[PDB]
Amino acid sequence: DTKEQRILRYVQQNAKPGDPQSVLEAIDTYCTQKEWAMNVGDAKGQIMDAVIREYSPSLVLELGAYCGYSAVRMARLLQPGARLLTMEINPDCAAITQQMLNFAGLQDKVTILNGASQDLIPQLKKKYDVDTLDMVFLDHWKDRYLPDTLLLEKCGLLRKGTVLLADNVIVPGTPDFLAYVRGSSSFECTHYSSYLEYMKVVDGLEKAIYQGP
Numbered sequence: 001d002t003k004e005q006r007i008l009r010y011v012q013q014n015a016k017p018g019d020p021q022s023v024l025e026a027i028d029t030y031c032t033q034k035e036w037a038m039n040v041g042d043a044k045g046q047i048m049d050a051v052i053r054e055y056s057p058s059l060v061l062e063l064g065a066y067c068g069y070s071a072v073r074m075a076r077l078l079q080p081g082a083r084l085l086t087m088e089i090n091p092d093c094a095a096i097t098q099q100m101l102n103f104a105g106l107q108d109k110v111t112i113l114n115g116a117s118q119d120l121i122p123q124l125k126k127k128y129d130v131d132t133l134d135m136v137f138l139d140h141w142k143d144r145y146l147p148d149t150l151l152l153e154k155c156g157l158l159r160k161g162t163v164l165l166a167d168n169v170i171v172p173g174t175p176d177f178l179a180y181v182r183g184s185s186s187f188e189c190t191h192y193s194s195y196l197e198y199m200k201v202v203d204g205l206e207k208a209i210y211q212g213p
């Protein structure tokens, strides 16, 4: 069985149905006590939460779902009528994430898209009825942060004010991405330091607000 299936069983056995907070605490507990996961963090969590609250986005795109932790985290803070589109390359993780969202009661706010970001991004306008995105959360393969940012721009999916939030930009690391957004007059960047408790290393997230062409 997969790590994601194990985390879901722990959630089903320990968390309270329909309670996103309880689902997040269960996942935090499992990952701290039993099996580490890169996408889970409570302190990376507070940073994500603060950004969602500040910008109250109506349409969020997430790259990388995994067990669905970050989808639960964001979707619980979205307003009635707001939508999260989350893209996941692995069909098993896509299935776990749907089950996690159903358990949390957040199914009505989230659409899971199965496939690779570079295949799905150019389809968002025609197939999924997107005009522009209010926010994008980058948490997929690190080597794809920069090409996918350039693709989102090129496909006309970013508007002036669209918030990009990129996780793990220090470890594993994303130096081409950071150089591009911090150097470009098309972006306004803020860095958020984030400690990785298990490995005992400083990481971070980058917030990059698109300014238009």
Ligand SMILES: Cc1nc(COc2cccc(Cl)c2)sc1-c1ccn[nH]1
Pocket: 063, 064, 065, 066, 087, 088, 089, 090, 115, 116, 117, 118, 139, 140, 141, 144
């Ligand atoms: C949503 C997504 N798109 C990705 C990039 O897709 C591909 C697929 C084949 C080759 C290349 Cl370079 C890229 S990785 C990925 C991901 C990570 C974890 N969950 N989801």
